Design a protein around this ligand. Sequence first.
Ligand SMILES: Cc1ccc(NC(=O)c2ccc(CN3CCN(C)CC3)cc2)cc1Nc1nccc(-c2cccnc2)n1
Ligand SMILES: COC(=O)c1ccc(Cl)cc1N
Ligand SMILES: [Cl-]
Ligand SMILES: [Cl-]
Ligand SMILES: [Cl-]
Ligand SMILES: [Cl-]
Length: 265
Amino acid sequence: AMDPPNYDKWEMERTDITMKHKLGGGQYGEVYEGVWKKYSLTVAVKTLVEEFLKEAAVMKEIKHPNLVQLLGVCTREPPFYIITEFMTYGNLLDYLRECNRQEVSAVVLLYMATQISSAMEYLEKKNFIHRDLAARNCLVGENHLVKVADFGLSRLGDTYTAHAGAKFPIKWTAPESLAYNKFSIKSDVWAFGVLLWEIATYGMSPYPGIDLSQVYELLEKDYRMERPEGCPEKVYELMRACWQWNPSDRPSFAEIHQAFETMFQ
Ligand SMILES: Cc1ccc(NC(=O)c2ccc(CN3CCN(C)CC3)cc2)cc1Nc1nccc(-c2cccnc2)n1
Ligand SMILES: COC(=O)c1ccc(Cl)cc1N
Ligand SMILES: [Cl-]
Ligand SMILES: [Cl-]
Ligand SMILES: [Cl-]
Ligand SMILES: [Cl-]
């Protein structure tokens, strides 16, 4: 930590953190479990350049109860660290697959959807684009608390597939993103509808068995995924709204969050 001369309040003493093993069996790349000794606090620590420093810069501009919280950075000297909170129950997709379904009931699914749409309303308000919203990019803490993250998973199976030295998760990717490389808050809104279907099925893969090279074709012919067992009609209506072909026809996250709020009470 710096003395208030290029001061950055986020810079911390690398030595304050005890680095343990790679997190989640190595599924996150160079991310480690850590203890910030002086707070007795378990943390997540991503390590390694422009991309990495641009990510740290972005995280300093964002703060929301449902976005994973940046705690500090070590970016003076290598090896560079970005340090965030550690969320006890791990990524949402695995959580939903593994959970006690009597505990994670219909109302809990509603609560998860609602928290995520909150985070996305805040990114929408700040003019940020997520670009890879999916259950695999969300984290679960105590009492069903859910936060949106971005683990940079595209180069870490067939979830992502190549597009010009880019890899895209086709089944979460809006039609104008597939066809024109156009990303916006409205392509996040499309991805959010897919996320809602993940939550509604307790973590099933979307478009089951559908070959990736026929996805665009099908969507252009108005095919959409069917309503999951037990999913309220109103929630399915929101999903279908998120999957409107023209991005301008899709609701805002402000609208979506308000719709879930109304339901969640
Ligand atoms: C250690 C770390 C470093 C960086 C990040 N970064 C982000 O999560 C993030 C979130 C949002 C943005 C916003 N950004 C807007 C612009 N578009 C293009 C991209 C997204 C950027 C980065 C998270 C983490 N946290 C993290 N990473 C991997 C795994 C875990 C983890 C695993 C299990 C239990 N608890 C925590 N925790
Ligand atoms: C009561 O709300 C629900 O049942 C519910 C809400 C969100 C999702 Cl994604 C699925 C559900 N099944
Ligand atoms: Cl300051
Ligand atoms: Cl995890
Ligand atoms: Cl952005
Ligand atoms: Cl937690």
